[PDB]
Design a protein around this ligand. Structure first.
Ligand SMILES: O=c1c(O)c(-c2ccc(O)c(O)c2)oc2cc(O)cc(O)c12
Ligand SMILES: [Zn+2]
Length: 227
């Protein structure tokens, strides 16, 4: 891992980097939230934001420093502070933000800024290409009601890497995490859906755990199978 200011960066693939944002919570400590940075030719594609806009701006700094390429668009997993904490930073930079239709509807309620674009999903969970213009390797898939009712997952086409967001947990986890607005009935079903959508993905990257194997999906489903 490479320390960069208040954040940590790590390379997973020759064109896929992972960022880690830390939120200082008195009494608990530092909560880490991961994200993905993929390079597509001469453009950069970012998945999710940091805990805060400031930290998100720090990511943009790293991108401009190491990659030196402009960000085409940014896709978030859900309307939560741990993934949509840097919406203003993106808008201030002029980066097009893409989020789920439900996320943009729940964002204002959660106290977050809705994205500029709304992703529409099919009955199979797959994203509608119409609302996904020039996404490239960013394949979006909506598993269903899990961590939230607006959570989505993104797979990096051209690589065996998939992002489980805050839905999927690591194979060494003991808890599912924040189950406040989570669906205790479709959690396992949704978790398994993601695994079926991307069965070739060996590296499952999440937001609160370091990139795990496919065992993370099964583990999450097995834990959610007890709800
Ligand atoms: O992802 C989240 C997260 O990690 C925590 C968190 C984790 C451990 C703690 O001990 C704690 O107090 C909070 O906050 C959250 C609050 C939300 O509304 C939604 C989230 O997704 C998170
Ligand atoms: Zn969340």
């Amino acid at each position: 891992d490479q320390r960069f200011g208040d954040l940590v960066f790590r390379q997973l693939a020759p064109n896929v980097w992972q960022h880690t944002s830390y939120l200082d919570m008195p009494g608990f400590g530092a909560v880490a939230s991961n994200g993905l940075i993929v390079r597509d030719g001469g453009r950069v594609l970012v998945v999710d934001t940091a805990w805060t806009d400031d930290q998100t701006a720090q990511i943009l700094n790293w991108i401009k420093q190491e990659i030196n390429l402009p960000v085409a668009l940014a896709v978030v997993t859900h309307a939560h502070q741990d993934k949509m904490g840097g919406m203003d930073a993106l808008h201030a930079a002029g980066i097009a933000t893409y989020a789920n239709a439900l996320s943009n509807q729940l964002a204002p309620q959660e106290g977050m800024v809705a994205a500029q674009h709304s992703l529409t999903f099919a009955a199979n969970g797959w994203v509608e290409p119409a609302t996904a213009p020039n996404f490239g390797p960013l394949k979006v898939f909506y598993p269903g009601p899990g961590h939230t009712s607006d959570n989505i997952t993104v797979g990096i086409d051209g690589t065996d890497i998939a992002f489980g967001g805050c839905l999927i947990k690591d194979s060494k986890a003991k808890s599912l995490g924040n189950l406040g607005d989570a669906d205790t009935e479709h959690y396992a079903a949704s978790a398994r859906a993601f695994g079926a959508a991307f069965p070739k993905a060996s590296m499952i990257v999440m937001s609160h755990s370091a990139p795990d194997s496919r065992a993370a999906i099964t583990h999450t489903a097995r834990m959610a199978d007890k709800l």
